[PDB]
C-alpha cells in the first residue's frame with residue numbers, strides 16, 4: 001500500500017557468512033523487501049546483500065560502500081517466475097554460488113523476485129505473462145536507484161545478469177532504459193519514482209527476438225531431421241529441482257516442408273537488418289542461406305574451437321573442424337551442426353498448437369497462450385489469436401538498438417555456448433553485431449562445448465566488470 005514508502009534502511013542489514021573457495025566471506029543481508037507499493041504477487045520482493053566491509057568503512061577489491069558495483073541477477077528461466085535469490089538458497093532455481101562469488105569480489109547484490117507466465121494472484125487469475133517479467137525487473141531497478149546512497153553500492157553502476165529467458169531479461173533491461181511503453185504498468189504497481197536505465201549488461205544465452213527465432217532455427221537446422229531434447233519425470237527431492245528425461249523424435253514430412261520455408265524467409269529477415277562487419281561490408285545471405293553472415297557464424301565457432309584447442313581440448317568431439325598444424329583453419333558448419341544435433345521441432349518457438357513456453361508467455365488474462373508470428377497464426381492447429389504487435393516489439397531487446405542511444409547501457413557482455421541448441425547461434429550473433437554497429441561496447445563469444453547454461457565463467461565476467469568499474 002501507500003504506507004510502503006519504498007525507503008531502504010541500512011538498519012535492516014544483519015550479519016551472515018558463507019564459504020567461498022574455502023574461506024569465509026562475511027556479508028550483511030536484508031530480505032523480503034516489497035519493492036512496489038501495489039504488488040499483485042507474493043514473488044515481488046527483493047533481497048539485498050552487502051560485503052561486510054561496507055558497513056565498517058572499509059574496502060573490497062578496490063571498492064567502497066559508495067562505489068561498489070550493484071549486481072542485479074535474476075533467476076528467470078523458461079519465462080517462468082524467478083524467486084528472489086540468496087547466497088544461502090539451495091532451492092531451485094538459484095544462482096546462489098554466483099552471489100557468493102560476487103560478494104567476495106566486492107559487489108553489492110540486489111536479487112529481485114520476478115513474476116512469470118505461471119504466476120497467479122490471490123484469486124487464481126494469471127498476472128505474470130508478458131510484459132510482467134521486464135516490468136518487475138524495471139521496478140526493482142527503480143527501487144535501487146530511488147534508494148541511491150541509502151542502499152550500499154553505486155546506483156550508477158547497476159549490472160544485470162541472467163541466463164536464457166533470464167538473459168533476455170537482463171538484455172531487455174539494458175536495451176529499454178526509461179522506455180515510455182512500460183510507464184503505465186509501473187505506475188499501476190506503484191514503483192519507485194526513479195529511472196531504470198542501467199550501466200552494463202551480462203547475458204548468458206539470451207532467449208530473445210522470439211518472433212524471428214523460428215526462422216533462425218530452421219536456417220540453422222534444416223536438413224537435420226531427428227531432434228533430441230528433454231521432458232520431466234516424476235520425483236520428489238529436497239532441492240525442488242525438476243528432474244528430466246530425454247525424449248527424441250523425427251520431423252514429419254509436413255514439418256520438413258515448413259522448415260524449408262522458414263529457412264528461406266530467414267535470408268530476407270537477416271538482410272533487411274542491414275548488419276555490417278567491422279570493415280563496414282553488409283552481412284548478407286543469398287536465397288539458399290549462404291553468404292557473408294553465414295561465414296561470420298562459422299568464424300565464431302572456429303574462434304571457439306581455437307581457444308579450446310590451445311587448452312589441449314580435443315575439438316574433434318564434434319565433426320567438421322579442419323586442423324592444419326596447430327591452427328583450426330576451417331569448419332564444415334553443416335557437419336558440426338549434424339554432430340551437435342537438433343533440439344527443437346518445427347516451429348521451434350511459436351508452436352502451432354500453442355504448447356511452447358513462449359506461446360504461454362504471450363497469453364493474457366483471457367487466453368492462456370497466443371501466437372506471435374504470422375506463419376504460426378496462419379497454420380494454427382488450434383483456435384488462437386496473435387499477441388499485440390507493440391507487446392512483441394516491446395520485449396525484444398533489438399527494437400531499441402536501431403540507434404546510438406543515451407538510454408541503452410553502454411557496456412555488454414554476451415555468451416552463448418557452442419553446444420547450446422536452445423536457439424540458433426544467429427540469434428545472439430545478431431544482438432552482438434547490432435550492438436557493435438551502433439557503437440555500444442560488446443564482449444561476445446561462443447564458449448567451446450558449453451551447453452544451455454550460464455555463470456560458468458565468473459572469473460572472466462568479474463574481470464570484465466572490474467575493468468569497467470575500478
Ligand SMILES: CCOC(=O)c1cc(O)c(O)c(O)c1
Pocket residue numbers: 076077078079163164165166207357358422423
Ligand atoms: C528452460 C531453460 O532456459 C530458458 O529460459 C528457456 C526459455 C525459453 O523460452 C526457451 O524456448 C528455451 O529453450 C529455454
